[PDB]
Amino acid sequence: RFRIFRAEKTYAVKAGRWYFEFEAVTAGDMRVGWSRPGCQLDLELGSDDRAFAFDGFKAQRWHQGNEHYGRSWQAGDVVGCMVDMNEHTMMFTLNGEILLDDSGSELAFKDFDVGDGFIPVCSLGVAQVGRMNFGKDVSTLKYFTICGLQEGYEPFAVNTNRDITMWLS
Ligand SMILES: [K+]
């Protein structure tokens, strides 16, 4: 079966600009993007409203269906995943280069509802190897300084270092 990896749902982002990387170690059937929290992702990623995904196998963008977008990865390529939760846009880079849809737009997805926010997600097909890097050690990100850093995006790990919550009785 397919393996779905997702950030812990308690770390979903509802504002700000966020970045993570996905290394396609193999070059086959994998998808990577942003998932709504607490939803069940038993379907193919982004076939419904539960996620927004880049399919680097077939060069498609997936949200409530598919359209051509970007280009396919080669083994060892790194996808950068960016979400601006205030402008309601998502962008992807492949080895630092911004991917475009057929209209020439860099907005992979736009005008989406914030809802309960988003967490990084990826799906790996049979025998596929793909690694999400949230950048806890920012120096392990490969393309953040090329595209992401100057644009004001924060590594997703910045939102996951806190492990304590507080409330008033
Ligand atoms: K943590």
The domain segmentation of the chain, as residue ranges, is 1-169
Starting at the edge strand that comes first in sequence, how are the strands of the sheet with 119-124 ordered?
3-6, 119-124, 30-35, 51-55, 60-62, 66-68
- Separation CA 135–CA 133 (nearest Å): 5
| 3-state percent breakdown (helix, strand, coil) of the chain, nearest 5 | 5, 35, 55
Tell me the CA–centroid distance for residue 132 and ligand 1, in Å: 15
> Do the beta carbons of residue 9 and residue 38 sit within 8 Å?
yes
Tell me the CA–centroid distance for residue 30 and ligand 1, in Å: 25
Q: Chain centroid to CA 142: how far? A: 15
- Separation CA 63–CA 49 (nearest Å): 6
Q: Chain centroid to CA 123: how far? A: 11
Tell me the CA–centroid distance for residue 163 and ligand 1, in Å: 5
Tell me the CA–centroid distance for residue 64 and ligand 1, in Å: 31
Tell me the CA–centroid distance for residue 91 and ligand 1, in Å: 25
Tell me the CA–centroid distance for residue 160 and ligand 1, in Å: 5
Tell me the CA–centroid distance for residue 104 and ligand 1, in Å: 38
Method for structure elucidation: X-ray
CA atoms within 13 A on the CB side of 87: 14
Tell me the CA–centroid distance for residue 135 and ligand 1, in Å: 13
Class of domain 1-169 (CATH, top level): mainly beta
Resolution in A: 1.4
Beta bridge partners of 78: 23
Tell me the CA–centroid distance for residue 14 and ligand 1, in Å: 18
- Name residue, tokens 């038993």: 42
Helices and strands of the chain, counted as H and E runs: 0, 13
> Do the beta carbons of residue 95 and residue 24 sit within 8 Å?
no
Tell me the CA–centroid distance for residue 103 and ligand 1, in Å: 39
Quick one: DSSP state of residue 157? G
Tell me the CA–centroid distance for residue 134 and ligand 1, in Å: 11
Tell me the CA–centroid distance for residue 7 and ligand 1, in Å: 10
Q: Chain centroid to CA 130: how far? A: 13
Residue 88, Cβ neighbours under 10 Å: how many? 14
